[PDB]
Symmetry: D2
Subunit: 293 residues, 4 copies
Amino acid sequence: MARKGIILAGGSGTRLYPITHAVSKQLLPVYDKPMIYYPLSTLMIAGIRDVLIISTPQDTPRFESMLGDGSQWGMNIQYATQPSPDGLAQAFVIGRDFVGNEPSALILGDNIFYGHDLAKQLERASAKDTGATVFAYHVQDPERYGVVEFDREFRAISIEEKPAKPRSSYAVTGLYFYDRQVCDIAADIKPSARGELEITDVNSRYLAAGQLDVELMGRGYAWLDTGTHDSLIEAGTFIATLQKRQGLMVACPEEIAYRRNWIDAEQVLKLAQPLAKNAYGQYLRNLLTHQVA
Amino acid sequence: ARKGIILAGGSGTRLYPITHAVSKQLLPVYDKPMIYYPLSTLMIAGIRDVLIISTPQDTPRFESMLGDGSQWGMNIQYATQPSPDGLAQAFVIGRDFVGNEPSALILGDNIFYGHDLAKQLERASAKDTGATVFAYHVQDPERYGVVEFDREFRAISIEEKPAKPRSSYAVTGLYFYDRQVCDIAADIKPSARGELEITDVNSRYLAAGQLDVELMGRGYAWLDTGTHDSLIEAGTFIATLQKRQGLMVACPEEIAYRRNWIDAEQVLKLAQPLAKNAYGQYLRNLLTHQVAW
Amino acid sequence: ARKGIILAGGSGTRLYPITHAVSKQLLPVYDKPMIYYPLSTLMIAGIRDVLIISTPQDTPRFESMLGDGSQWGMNIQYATQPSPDGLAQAFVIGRDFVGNEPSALILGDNIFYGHDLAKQLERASAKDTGATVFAYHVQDPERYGVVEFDREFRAISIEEKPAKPRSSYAVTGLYFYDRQVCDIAADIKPSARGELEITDVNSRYLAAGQLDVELMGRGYAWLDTGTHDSLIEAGTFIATLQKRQGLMVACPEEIAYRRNWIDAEQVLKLAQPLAKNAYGQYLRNLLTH
Amino acid sequence: ARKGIILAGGSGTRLYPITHAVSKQLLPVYDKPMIYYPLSTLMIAGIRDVLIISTPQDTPRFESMLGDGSQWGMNIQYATQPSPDGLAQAFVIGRDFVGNEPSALILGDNIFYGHDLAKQLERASAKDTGATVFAYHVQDPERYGVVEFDREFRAISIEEKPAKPRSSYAVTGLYFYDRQVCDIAADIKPSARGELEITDVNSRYLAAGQLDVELMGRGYAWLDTGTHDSLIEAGTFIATLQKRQGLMVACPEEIAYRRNWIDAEQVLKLAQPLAKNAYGQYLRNLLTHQVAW
Ligand SMILES: Cc1cn([C@H]2C[C@H](O)[C@@H](COP(=O)(O)OP(=O)(O)O[C@H]3O[C@@H](C)[C@H](O)[C@@H](O)[C@H]3O)O2)c(=O)[nH]c1=O
Ligand SMILES: Cc1cn([C@H]2C[C@H](O)[C@@H](COP(=O)(O)OP(=O)(O)O[C@H]3O[C@@H](C)[C@H](O)[C@@H](O)[C@H]3O)O2)c(=O)[nH]c1=O
Ligand SMILES: Cc1cn([C@H]2C[C@H](O)[C@@H](COP(=O)(O)OP(=O)(O)O[C@H]3O[C@@H](C)[C@H](O)[C@@H](O)[C@H]3O)O2)c(=O)[nH]c1=O
Ligand SMILES: Cc1cn([C@H]2C[C@H](O)[C@@H](COP(=O)(O)OP(=O)(O)O[C@H]3O[C@@H](C)[C@H](O)[C@@H](O)[C@H]3O)O2)c(=O)[nH]c1=O
Ligand SMILES: O=c1ccn([C@H]2C[C@H](O)[C@@H](COP(=O)(O)O)O2)c(=O)[nH]1
Ligand SMILES: O=c1ccn([C@H]2C[C@H](O)[C@@H](COP(=O)(O)O)O2)c(=O)[nH]1
Ligand SMILES: O=c1ccn([C@H]2C[C@H](O)[C@@H](COP(=O)(O)O)O2)c(=O)[nH]1
Ligand SMILES: O=c1ccn([C@H]2C[C@H](O)[C@@H](COP(=O)(O)O)O2)c(=O)[nH]1
């Protein structure tokens, strides 16, 4: 099974003006790499090799100049455009031909996922052939998101988009795994009062059918988005603290692709050669000697 | 029941002058004293009997902060180390406290954080013979006890601050031992740097084929606080998670409550003197807010 | 011969539990205890006689940290405040220490930093009569004494914690007084919030036409540490400056040395027990840099 | 009528990959693009005519970010530098722009902050003959032009990146020049490193007795952003001030408004499309604010 991945990295509004005035939010740094490296690496760790990047028409060339066609990482990366940010579920209209008759995953281009055993959880979700998987995460401001209502046993009862009175602090994260039904469901839902095709309508539909796994993503994980200037810089210092302590890089696509044998040592060296003087290139070269289990 | 020791003794003048009057483990890591973090790690391991070892002058300062632990359904006792003459002294000083039980040692300035930590601590705690240490990939392994690995799994050596570290895996400040450790610690002699070495304890188990090295993956944060910079970074790391989640790292009242070591009545009694501040409100919210555990 | 007071007493439980065992003003701001900063501010103002007021339980810890100040060519004395009953109580407790000299009060948790701070402190210390306070634009002025200005920006009134602040300018925690202040502090009565208010002291000088309210511009950092967030933010702020410059903010040995209160031999005696750490190396570099 | 040049050209690949995507000087420093900071420094010195020099690839990106400056009552023009062949090249590329007027050069990645900065820039800006540079005590002076001082602490020479620095005082990335500078730059010859050195430009003024070297005290922040660490630290530095004060560092609308380059009506036209975000709110409060003398 070849699950097809979608990174939605389109228009993010003007909350961060003026740092997003010229530059797309998802090309801005989180410490030492562009933001979009993080959700890209999350898909790679889930085993996904076919990725569609959806951005605004104005910014697609900027993303393409950054990531290419993915062949440098043994991946296939393609591009499509979203003229206005008219809903997350619109990804499954724009990306319908890319998805084909395959399972898929959607991730937001500004969402950072980090924590121990993340790969096992993403691999279990990626491997299921029917139904859907989303993740629930305790946050300070749940009213910003789709919010999960849980019974005493943490069985999911409902999902509401931006409720006035959140039923819990558990938000639906910006990562979704779907079987082959999702594109047709996306054709059946209707734009909401805020004028958007709602991923929450997709998700509540799977929940009503008894086909939604709502997985708790515990407090040991970091699920960060970067909605304010404070939380953007906080995500950067968070990554820096881990990397400097460990001598390991978070979300290095060459590392992940090499460890999964999507690229070999020769290809790692070819990527490192123009970067030999800087820290990223030296990190790539050090992959060929290093031992990590 | 496994008995825990927090070694919170003298740290020298490395951090002068912030440690001139006050012990390091009473200093803040963001919003709570440092020692709350290793204490909470022992509690997460299921350990309820804890010995605090500090300098004689600082014992009252720690006792005023933690008491006898009965407020958290624990038993906390105190012993002294006049001079920081080696980690293995925890099992000489703590010999009567350990008695004939299994034990664990944790450093008072070590912060462990990450998803599923409890499962790993419980697995180590469940061993009935041998010892368990945790290996963590760091930038500068020569600062620590270093694990050497063969091509496969096994750890084949541990070396204290080697000139040529045989790997990047540092032995963390958390150790689990069977009933042999107190006699082993009485049998070894101080090293060339004049200290009773936990590495020499661990090498005794290794030579007997009784040392398990549990890998602590890059998804975990293992932070210590050896410099002014790393001390303040540990604070900003905690702050990023807590501001994101609305959850507290290392709240002993929370952990004891969720484990049913204390009930809702006791939580309320602890919240009563703090009613106005954020910590008291956090304690109150434990009884009303739904949090998965 | 102005005499200084550092008010480093009970700060309540807002920062609980980091202040449960240890007093706020002994906690680190990056690489040194908080109280080093306001102490160094007094030193930069030229003040060599300092009274530290803390709770009864914490004076030994402050005394262990600073001693009698003779190591820096200063005189540091200690007094206690049983309950935190108002900033103006500093001049009741410290009345005998002040004597009939001019004085200055600074809060033990206030950090002042910026270019030409010394010149501004020297002008205030040089006033013969009256008082000087500093006004600083802040995000949350309602937490403080707030300055009301007339149309031409003269200070005309001050109110403690106003419901609707009349400006964004707070009175900082640094105050200069002539010989009137101790008798003024004995005359005021506790306010509705039950405290002897420094705003009442300052209002009396202002009502008499004897208060200079000096604007402290946005180029200065005036930091207190009222939240866990602002405590750590002050630390990263100091760290960025020090790591960039290779210079230390608020090193008392440095300040006493550059002011010739101690000589090169005294610096070396202070550095010798600190030889292994970075602070001792900084002291040694004072003689070479 | 002094004319300003912001040198914001090729920065190399030390910051790869965050500069693969975006030009360095468009990267965020907390809540605004890096280039806002040096732009505002020129504005505080009273300079209204600014030349931005960048790479050919990056000039369009700066243009979309800043326009022609008429929105701030300024005149902003653009020129290109195909190769980063030396700071002194700004006065070759920008020779026509300067004409026969005095000028100033600032680095596009340099942040200046501190009390009375305006008074010092105004003094430098008014000097009819000669040039003015700034000396600043730094940890690592060998990275820069280093000032040599005599016993009387008067400047004797400037060495570019000496192996053995004669002081800790570096020349900051801000320079004021008379009408000699454009001819002097065409006169100089490339150094052992194929670059036209501003240090050589400055030496000519010094040898002629026409260089003022002003000490910039430890109360000022002079920051550059040469590493991932120093880039993010510059952001946290700004954030601490702004959150404490409720004032923004380097808001060009604010500086231009207070200098009467634009009027209240113009500020409102700028705020209107930004009404929902924090920056627009800040512009609106300028018309109601009490912040003056
Ligand atoms: C709506 C939308 C957003 N985006 C981008 C902008 C942001 O970087 C990112 C999210 O934008 P928002 O306005 O916050 O989307 P949003 O308001 O729909 O937030 C979503 O957040 C998820 C985490 C929850 O699971 C959802 O239930 C929902 O709450 O996606 C697009 O590119 N296209 C779009 O159509
Ligand atoms: C030596 C010692 C330290 N300490 C405190 C001081 C610090 O807070 C903390 C660590 O002190 P150090 O000098 O760094 O110890 P250390 O130099 O012995 O380091 C140890 O570090 C562990 C992480 C490794 O697993 C060990 O193998 C070893 O490297 O423990 C005591 O309380 N008592 C002592 O006897
Ligand atoms: C009241 C009081 C405080 N303190 C300490 C506690 C804090 O560290 C510090 C300030 O305490 P607070 O309760 O915040 O004080 P406060 O509530 O009086 O705040 C003061 O702040 C100044 C900056 C203003 O200029 C004053 O006008 C006033 O607003 O002083 C004492 O040591 N003793 C006391 O009696
Ligand atoms: C050389 C050069 C740099 N730049 C950019 C790249 C950086 O963002 C910035 C500085 O470039 P560097 O390689 O560091 O140049 P540099 O090595 O000349 O550093 C300079 O630093 C100044 C602060 C000192 O006053 C000078 O004396 C000098 O030391 O300017 C250009 O745009 N064009 C150029 O030709
Ligand atoms: O009340 C609690 C529960 C957990 N943890 C810490 C222990 C581990 O570091 C991590 C557990 O994360 P999960 O296993 O819930 O994802 O959080 C706390 O500090 N307090
Ligand atoms: O090359 C890699 C491997 C893992 N991770 C991330 C994915 C998860 O967030 C975490 C995995 O940690 P462990 O499960 O190995 O502890 O690190 C990377 O960024 N790059
Ligand atoms: O030894 C010293 C000298 C100065 N400063 C502080 C006081 C002011 O905040 C600032 C003075 O800056 P300048 O006036 O020297 O630029 O530095 C110190 O902390 N220690
Ligand atoms: O609108 C303004 C005014 C000043 N400053 C900066 C320039 C100096 O770095 C400092 C001036 O502080 P004072 O000179 O007002 O103290 O603030 C700005 O960024 N924007």
